[PDB]
């Protein structure tokens, strides 16, 4: 008897993307998960290789396999093309961006072992809309817009409560700025209160985003599930990554009804690109989320325990964790504890 | 000289009581002209921002203001924002500085200033609409070359006046190319005119990760309205909480000194509130009106009261009360 082979799309990305994905696929091959990799290009590399930021072959590959493991993609700051991360999240309607932040041993984080939260970030609307961005002809006045829908808010908050119930956690906190941004953030919060009604055993808390960031750096232990809109969830999940030892230890799963793309929270880290310093643990923790999603919880747990045990033994840790190791050294250290 | 005093909402009254007690004990020579804004003015005369309040601030050019409540969702738009727009107080100056015995999760090396654009960005009433059927909502942000230029100039001029060495412009110009993009291009052009000051650019999410890992790297942070709101609340947390975070609304012709924190309705009226934030705001005010010696005496007294653990509010782990804490600070003036 063999296990079923499962094909996943693999996007190797830009900057540190290629080195951490080589490390990650090494560790997943050592796991013996029965995965076959179908490589696709997106963003910068896709544009130069196929003349298209998001090639039809990449869309067809993700549509067929319904699962991708993805390295970070660069999007240029200011003058240039629009985010292919956002474009893929919109195209596959991956509306739930699920970002757990959990204390690990022997990191450089300033916080003790009490952090254990999940950010559920709305992933398709809010302030991350390419449309409505305009600069006046004389370069004097720029406008940008945000859009929040009843349907979008409903499905993200229902995701957060269903996650609370499936995981046995007790509190969902809806994070907003509805005092100032009454239309969009306001609609999100009214829908969040309507949805909370249907899960009476789960504590529902509301909180303004600035207070939330202050509370996160003073008593991050109070938080369980945080549900919020696209931009706020972006800022909050990067802050929570800081609480548990930095971007090297923070995964983010983009979940939709028919498809899922698993990645790290972090970007392409151009300052260290190609120097073998990057921590591959964020992408490996995303691959662990992927393993839970595709029905291999025992292998997901095994990868997580291997990572924890490797940090516990301080074995071949990258510089971001206060080690002198390298990406592939760190990967081999984790592979050897499987 | 006369300053406009707005006693405000929730904890506003108790902390303003404590603050004015300490300013008297300091002998700053201030006369207090009381005005209402927000809920109190609304209740009394049916106007959130009465012409008498606008005339008080226009005349004195200096206000000391407690927190004003803004309803969450449907209801009036912020009277804090309304006064910042009306008086064009474009520079919101929020220093975040480590204090002793301060119950912060952090080291003792935080020393930075957030310079937050205070009149535009995403804090715009106009453009907020909901569809007839209640299904779709939209909101807008506006950024101008003029507004971006004046706030980045303020950041670089503040670096020179303070001896500080680095300005970091925080943005999301990768995703929000029009508004955040225009702010970032204006920041690069202004940096050009201050060649001895280090200029750094940093995306806002990276910046929040950096703030919780090594806040010591930051000197002056300059950013747009909403980002500066989030970042300055995160930095307050870095240095012991909202009890210790002042915020000055500075414009050319007027200035409003306040705490970063809101009306704190969960503790309002219980004498629990920490008055230090508003008192550090009053020290920014003393520096602004030409009383630097008295500003420094007030800061030293607050530092020495924290070092002594004398009558601290529960947010700093004490069991002292608002007035007690102010009296303890007054005692060391
Ligand atoms: N989902 C995505 O693909 C994604 C996410 C965030 C940013 N980006 C893109 O990445 C580019 C650069 O963004 P940025 O500089 O603001 O943030 P970044 O996430 O790429 O890096 C910020 C800091 O964290 C460090 N860092 C990140 N990941 C690390 C790792 N695995 N190991 C060690 N250190 C790590 C970097 O060296 C850097 O100093 C931008 O063009 C942005 O559009 C993409
Ligand atoms: N400039 C201002 O006047 C201002 C600023 C922020 C919020 N607000 C308004 O305040 C209201 C409440 O907002 P919020 O609850 O999100 O934020 P908040 O700042 O009022 O409260 C945050 C938390 O910090 C605590 N806290 C705040 N100030 C404190 C102090 N001085 N000492 C001890 N503990 C303190 C509170 O008890 C609360 O738990 C809202 O209506 C909002 O619109 C006004």
Cα separation of the two ends of chain A: 22
Query: Residue B312 Cα, ligand 2 centroid: separation in angstroms?
Result: 19
* Contact yes or no for B313/B273 (Cβ under 8 A): yes
Q: What's the per-residue H, E or C state across B209-239?
A: HHHHHCHHHCCEEEECHHHHHHHHHHHHHHC
Residue carrying the six token digits 């601030």: B57
Q: Which atom number of ligand 2 is nearest to the Cα of residue B261? A: 19
Instruction: Please report which helix (H) or strand (E) contains residue A98, including its range.
Output: strand A96-102
Give the whole-angstrom CA distance, residue A218 versus residue A202. 24
Q: At A297, list the tokens.
A: 């919880």
Asked whether the CA dihedral B17, B23, B26, B30 is positive or negative, the reply is: negative
> By C-alpha distance, which of B258, B308, B323, B329 is closest to B65?
B258
> By C-alpha distance, which of B300, B302, B309 is closest to B329?
B302
Strand A225-228 vs strand A203-208: parallel, antiparallel, or unpaired? Answer: unpaired
Catalytic residue among B61, B65, B97, B172: B172
Give the whole-angstrom CA distance, residue A10 versus residue B157. 49
Nearest-by-CA chain A residue for B70: A179
Coil, strand or helix at A61: helix
Nearest-by-CA chain A residue for B142: A143
Q: At A312, list the tokens.
A: 């516990």
Strand partners, B268: none
Phi/psi for A71 (5° steps) reads -85, 165
Query: Residue A210 Cα, ligand 2 centroid: separation in angstroms?
Result: 10
Q: Could you say which ligand is closest to the alpha carbon of residue B66? A: 2
Coil, strand or helix at B128: coil
Q: At B222, list the tokens.
A: 């300059």
Cα separation of the two ends of chain B: 21
Q: Quick one: resolution in A?
A: 2.3
Phi/psi for B188 (5° steps) reads -60, -45
Give the whole-angstrom CA distance, residue A125 versus residue A104. 32
Give the whole-angstrom CA distance, residue A317 versus residue A310. 8
* Contact yes or no for A318/A284 (Cβ under 8 A): no
Mutual orientation of helices A297-312 and A327-335 as an angle, nearest 10°? 120
Give the whole-angstrom CA distance, residue A232 versus residue B47. 33
Give the whole-angstrom CA distance, residue B30 versus residue B2. 6
Output DSSP code: residue A126: B
- Nearest-CB residue to B73 (from A110, A182, A214): A182
Q: Could you say which ligand is closest to the alpha carbon of residue A251? A: 1
Q: Which atom number of ligand 1 is nearest to the Cα of residue A319? A: 33
Q: How far is CA B232 from the centre of its chain?
A: 8
Strand partners, B176: none
Q: Is A330 exposed, middle or buried (0-12, 13-18, 19+ CB in 10 A)?
A: buried
CB contact under 8 A, B72 and A189: yes
Give the whole-angstrom CA distance, residue A8 versus residue A67. 5
Strand B136-144 vs strand B111-117: parallel, antiparallel, or unpaired? Answer: unpaired
Query: What DSSP assignment string belongs to B245-304?
Result: -EEEEE-SS-EEEEESS---TTTTTTT-S--HHHHHHHHHHHHHTT-HHHHHHHHHHHHH
Q: A53: distance to nearest CA of chain B, Å?
A: 15
Mutual orientation of helices A297-312 and A17-31 as an angle, nearest 10°? 110
- Beta-carbon neighbour count of residue B241 at 10 Å? 26
């Amino acid at each position: 008897h063999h296990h079923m082979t499962q094909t996943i799309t693999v996007i190797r990305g830009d900057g540190i993307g290629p080195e951490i994905m080589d490390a990650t696929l090494f560790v997943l091959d050592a796991l013996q998960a029965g995965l076959t990799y179908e490589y696709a290009d997106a963003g910068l590399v896709a544009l130069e290789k196929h003349g298209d930021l998001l090639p039809e072959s990449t869309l067809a590959s993700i549509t067929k396999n319904k699962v991708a493991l993805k390295s970070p993609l660069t999007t240029p700051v200011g003058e240039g093309f629009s985010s292919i991360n956002v474009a893929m999240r919109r195209k596959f309607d991956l509306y739930a961006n699920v970002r757990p932040a959990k204390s690990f041993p022997n990191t450089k984080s300033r916080f003790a072992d009490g952090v254990d939260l999940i950010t559920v970030r709305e992933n398709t609307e809010g302030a991350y809309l390419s449309e409505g961005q305009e600069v006046s002809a004389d370069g004097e006045v720029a406008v940008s817009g945000a859009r929040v829908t009843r349907k979008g808010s409903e499905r993200i908050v229902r995701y957060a409560f269903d996650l609370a119930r499936a995981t046995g956690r007790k509190k969902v906190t809806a994070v907003h700025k509805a005092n100032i941004i009454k239309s969009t953030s306001g609609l999100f919060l009214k829908v969040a209160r309507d949805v909370a009604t249907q899960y009476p055993e789960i504590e529902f808390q509301e909180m303004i985003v600035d207070n939330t960031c202050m509370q996160l750096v003073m008593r991050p232990e109070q938080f369980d599930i945080i549900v919020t809109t696209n931009l706020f969830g972006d800022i909050i999940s990067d802050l929570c990554a800081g609480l548990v030892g930095g971007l090297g230890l923070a995964p983010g799963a983009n979940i939709g009804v028919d498809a899922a793309i698993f990645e790290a929270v972090h970007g392409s880290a151009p300052d260290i690109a190609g120097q073998g310093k990057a921590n591959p643990c964020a992408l490996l923790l995303g691959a662990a989320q992927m393993l839970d999603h595709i029905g291999q919880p025992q292998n997901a747990e095994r990868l997580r325990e291997a990572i924890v045990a490797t940090l516990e033994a301080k074995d071949s840790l990258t510089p971001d964790l206060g080690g002198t190791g390298n990406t592939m050294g760190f990967a081999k250290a984790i592979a050897s504890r499987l």
